[PDB]
Amino acid sequence: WTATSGSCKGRCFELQEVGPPDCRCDNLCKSYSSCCHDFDELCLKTARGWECTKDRCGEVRNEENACHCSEDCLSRGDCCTNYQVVCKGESHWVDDDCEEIKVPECPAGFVRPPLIIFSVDGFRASYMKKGSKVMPNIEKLRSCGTHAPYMRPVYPTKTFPNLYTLATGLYPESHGIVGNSMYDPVFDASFHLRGREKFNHRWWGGQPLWITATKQGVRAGTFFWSVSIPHERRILTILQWLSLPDNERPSVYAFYSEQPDFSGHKYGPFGPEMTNPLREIDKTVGQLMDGLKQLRLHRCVNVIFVGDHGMEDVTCDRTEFLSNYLTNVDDITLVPGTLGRIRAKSINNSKYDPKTIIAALTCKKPDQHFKPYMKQHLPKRLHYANNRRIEDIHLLVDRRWHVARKPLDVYKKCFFQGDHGFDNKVNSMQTVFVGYGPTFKYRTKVPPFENIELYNVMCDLLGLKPAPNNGTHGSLNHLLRTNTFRPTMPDEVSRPNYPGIMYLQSEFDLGCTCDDKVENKLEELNKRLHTKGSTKERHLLYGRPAVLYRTSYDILYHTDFESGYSEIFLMPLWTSYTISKQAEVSSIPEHLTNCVRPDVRVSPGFSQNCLAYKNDKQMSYGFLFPPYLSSSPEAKYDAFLVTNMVPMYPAFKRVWAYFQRVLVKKYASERNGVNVISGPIFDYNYDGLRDTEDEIKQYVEGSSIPVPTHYYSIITSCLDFTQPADKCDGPLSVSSFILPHRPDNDESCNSSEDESKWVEELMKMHTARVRDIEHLTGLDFYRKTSRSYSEILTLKTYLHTYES
Numbered sequence: 001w002t003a004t005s006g007s008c009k010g011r012c013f014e015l016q017e018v019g020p021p022d023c024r025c026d027n028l029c030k031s032y033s034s035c036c037h038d039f040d041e042l043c044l045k046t047a048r049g050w051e052c053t054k055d056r057c058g059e060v061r062n063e064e065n066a067c068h069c070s071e072d073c074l075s076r077g078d079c080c081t082n083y084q085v086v087c088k089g090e091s092h093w094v095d096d097d098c099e100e101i102k103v104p105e106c107p108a109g110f111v112r113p114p115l116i117i118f119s120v121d122g123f124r125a126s127y128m129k130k131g132s133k134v135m136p137n138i139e140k141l142r143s144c145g146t147h148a149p150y151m152r153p154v155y156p157t158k159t160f161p162n163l164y165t166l167a168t169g170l171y172p173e174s175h176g177i178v179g180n181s182m183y184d185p186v187f188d189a190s191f192h193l194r195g196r197e198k199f200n201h202r203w204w205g206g207q208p209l210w211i212t213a214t215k216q217g218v219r220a221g222t223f224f225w226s227v228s229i230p231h232e233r234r235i236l237t238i239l240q241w242l243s244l245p246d247n248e249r250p251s252v253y254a255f256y257s258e259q260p261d262f263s264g265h266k267y268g269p270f271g272p273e274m275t276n277p278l279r280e281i282d283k284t285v286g287q288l289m290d291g292l293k294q295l296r297l298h299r300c301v302n303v304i305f306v307g308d309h310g311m312e313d314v315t316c317d318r319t320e321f322l323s324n325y326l327t328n329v330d331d332i333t334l335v336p337g338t339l340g341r342i343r344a345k346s347i348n349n350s351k352y353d354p355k356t357i358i359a360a361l362t363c364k365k366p367d368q369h370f371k372p373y374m375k376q377h378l379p380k381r382l383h384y385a386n387n388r389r390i391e392d393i394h395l396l397v398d399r400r401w402h403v404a405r406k407p408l409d410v411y412k413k414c415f416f417q418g419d420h421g422f423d424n425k426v427n428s429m430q431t432v433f434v435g436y437g438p439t440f441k442y443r444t445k446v447p448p449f450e451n452i453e454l455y456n457v458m459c460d461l462l463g464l465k466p467a468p469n470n471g472t473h474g475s476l477n478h479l480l481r482t483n484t485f486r487p488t489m490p491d492e493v494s495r496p497n498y499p500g501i502m503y504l505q506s507e508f509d510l511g512c513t514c515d516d517k518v519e520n521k522l523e524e525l526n527k528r529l530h531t532k533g534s535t536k537e538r539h540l541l542y543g544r545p546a547v548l549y550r551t552s553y554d555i556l557y558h559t560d561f562e563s564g565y566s567e568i569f570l571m572p573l574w575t576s577y578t579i580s581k582q583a584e585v586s587s588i589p590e591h592l593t594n595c596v597r598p599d600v601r602v603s604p605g606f607s608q609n610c611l612a613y614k615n616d617k618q619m620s621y622g623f624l625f626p627p628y629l630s631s632s633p634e635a636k637y638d639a640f641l642v643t644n645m646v647p648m649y650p651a652f653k654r655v656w657a658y659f660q661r662v663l664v665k666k667y668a669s670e671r672n673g674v675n676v677i678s679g680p681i682f683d684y685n686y687d688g689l690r691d692t693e694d695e696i697k698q699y700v701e702g703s704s705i706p707v708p709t710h711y712y713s714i715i716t717s718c719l720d721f722t723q724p725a726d727k728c729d730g731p732l733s734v735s736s737f738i739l740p741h742r743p744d745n746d747e748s749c750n751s752s753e754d755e756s757k758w759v760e761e762l763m764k765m766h767t768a769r770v771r772d773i774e775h776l777t778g779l780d781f782y783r784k785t786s787r788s789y790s791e792i793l794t795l796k797t798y799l800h801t802y803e804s
């Protein structure tokens, strides 16, 4: 109940929250149906429109008018945005040449440059170039300020998950808005786009920018706008708030536009109808900048122009139906569209089985346009699993497609030509970032980056300490002229042991064998030097990774590779080696096919054993440093050490052997040498974070050898590929992957074919940032380079996407 009998007199767009049942006058009162009876008359005036004309100049103030052209309007802070152009001979902001803003030029009484976030729904990255002719205001912001060619959204590339990731710095799995539609099984409640459940504070987690600002004494405009409030009125409200007395005036503001998303859904991303919504957005930008110029704020305010996600061509005829796959379609609930999420229709149904559902959805039709996954098996780069609101079964839908339960859902619910939601590396889903103002750089292009990183920068722009989030603070310092945040490297927590030769061969009883008993002060001093680290500068190019948690581990050196061997997990945490462009690939000689060799630096009690692999009928083993890339026949023996061995399913060994035998050499050819760091990952609770020993759900049968959920590699070379990876003077280039360690290749529908037709495609799907690996392993890479630390942080957030 709302006692709508109160009044909005002197309260239009008030900032304080006012509680039930007293009526409201704020920018969301419409959406709640709680506005005072006179909100429309007083607060949403429309009379005479939004623009001054010659004859209104100097007019007698008439308070009924939407905006004013009277002489007192500047002091009242309510002129039409074009007042000074029409009535005082001024230019539009867009018509002025851009001039570097070296220092803020703010009016008396401004304690910091204000931040205005101009957010646009459905604004596809390629609109910046393709619509540039019809968007002169936005084009001036882009060209004169700091811009990226695109900004990567979070998955799913839906509206509320991305707007709230913008506000919080968090993955949707952490902030809790994992879809526009959700079911929370603990609340037993459904969240929808439409209706009242979404207003409940229990859905939204983390700490959004407006709350961070308020807790730290920086005042915030109300960021959200009811749909029926016209954009002109939104702009005028922001400009009015900017004329408040100093102690009342917010320092951070947001504008939101439902366009171009609204028309994009109707007409597709490049429909000819799309020009007009782009023109309209640009005019709104021009209104704001003109108004800032009137307030003498256009060289004081930092403006961010930022989108949530792109838009793809999608029509009704490109829908897959689950009724074409499942016998029992009525036993499931599907969340449909550009992603699918499946759960049981009734919790009392004991004949529900996720395994039979996944199997019935796996590689069933040759052209099949979605792929099913248990959520723990989704590419780790999506970070889309650790929340009870994400259903166990997920369908990753191909771009341009939908999934639905039954055909009647599509016609008895084409209506549309565009949609979004797909995998966040898809080019059509990319969106925009421009920053303009005294704190941003001048005419500067920055590489693409992820929207999770923006919250830290917005905190930096406002002098705020960010709440804990998933950005990597300092990774975007290159966007800023000042206010940079100068991080320090984490301290290493565990220091390694450096074992020498301490065990005789006969102390081991591992059940391993090797035909190695074939055999010189010349070559012996040499191999002793190798075991003490004499080649370590070649293979460990950026320093040893730091172990950021408490553990017990050994550094082991060899001719061709170096490793940090965990005595707790009985295998390396990391293995580092460099492969030059000139390096040669060799076979595993026939006498060495099954060779495993005890490591005399490491005790039997801290070693794996071959008997456990013989007895485990599901598990085989592979090696981290590949025997194919040995520098010489004699060095090859080091690759068969028990301390280089890791547990691998035979299906996974197909993937790993092709990567090691074929791909590493290909990368070394193409990139002029590569440095590789490989290793295991254990993430059994799918939280994106390194497991502790007591979280491990599976061991090699009969043993304490833990089975990895994933294997990673980080592959680094010189950005200037005219220099070899091992003699690089400048910035680096990196690509990485986190491959799921699965006992089948059901994910790859073409896997019965030769690895050359499917392995690299799998690896590309499981592309990762170095930072993703850091979280999953508790390691910190690139500790010793000649690069600035902020540049290294940017390198660790890079994602190699393989989109063209």
Ligand SMILES: *[C@@H]1O[C@H](CO)[C@@H](O[C@@H]2O[C@H](CO)[C@@H](O[C@@H]3O[C@H](CO[C@H]4O[C@H](CO)[C@@H](O)[C@H](O[C@H]5O[C@H](CO)[C@@H](O)[C@H](O)[C@@H]5O[C@H]5O[C@H](CO)[C@@H](O)[C@H](O)[C@@H]5O)[C@@H]4O)[C@@H](O)[C@H](O[C@H]4O[C@H](CO)[C@@H](O)[C@H](O)[C@@H]4O[C@H]4O[C@H](CO)[C@@H](O)[C@H](O)[C@@H]4O)[C@@H]3O)[C@H](O)[C@H]2NC(C)=O)[C@H](O)[C@H]1NC(C)=O
Pocket: 170, 171, 173, 174, 175, 176, 202, 203, 204, 205, 206, 383, 386, 387, 388, 468, 469, 470, 687, 688, 689, 775
């Ligand atoms: C991306 O960045 C974010 C932010 O930095 C990272 O998330 C953090 O990760 C931490 C580890 O997973 C986690 O720390 C835990 O906090 C627990 C208290 O949590 C509450 O308080 C905080 C602070 O205000 C609050 O933010 C939390 O909010 C969560 O939960 C509510 C739902 O109630 C949501 O609205 C909200 O969105 C958020 O949910 C998300 O996180 C939770 C986990 O907290 C998930 O369950 C959700 O699915 C969702 O993703 C909370 O309200 C604290 O209790 C934990 O301590 C346990 O473990 C330690 C070991 O050190 C030990 O001291 C304790 O014994 C304790 O164990 C006990 O609980 C066990 C489980 O019940 C039980 O088995 C034991 O027997 C014990 O009783 C822990 O320190 C932190 O909460 C989140 N923060 C956020 C905002 O999510 C994220 O990791 C980053 N991602 C990547 C990939 O890097």
Ligand SMILES: O=C(/C=C/c1ccc(OC(F)(F)F)cc1)N1CC[C@@H]2CN(C(=O)[C@@H]3CCc4[nH]nnc4C3)C[C@@H]2CC1
Pocket: 028, 031, 117, 119, 163, 164, 166, 167, 168, 198, 199, 200, 201, 209, 223, 224, 225, 226, 227, 254, 255, 256
């Ligand atoms: O105006 C906006 C969006 C503004 C915006 C600005 C900046 C930004 O990025 C930044 F954060 F980085 F700046 C992100 C979003 N929208 C989109 C979001 C929803 C929220 N809503 C509700 O009704 C809310 C639902 C949830 C909720 N909980 N308490 N009040 C509310 C209102 C209807 C709808 C209003 C129109």
Ligand SMILES: [Ca+2]
Pocket: 682, 683, 684, 685, 686, 687, 688, 689, 690, 691
């Ligand atoms: Ca984990």
Ligand code: NA
Pocket: 745, 746, 747, 748, 749, 750, 751, 752
């Ligand atoms: Na397959």
Ligand SMILES: [Zn+2]
Pocket: 122, 159, 261, 262, 265, 420
């Ligand atoms: Zn949309």
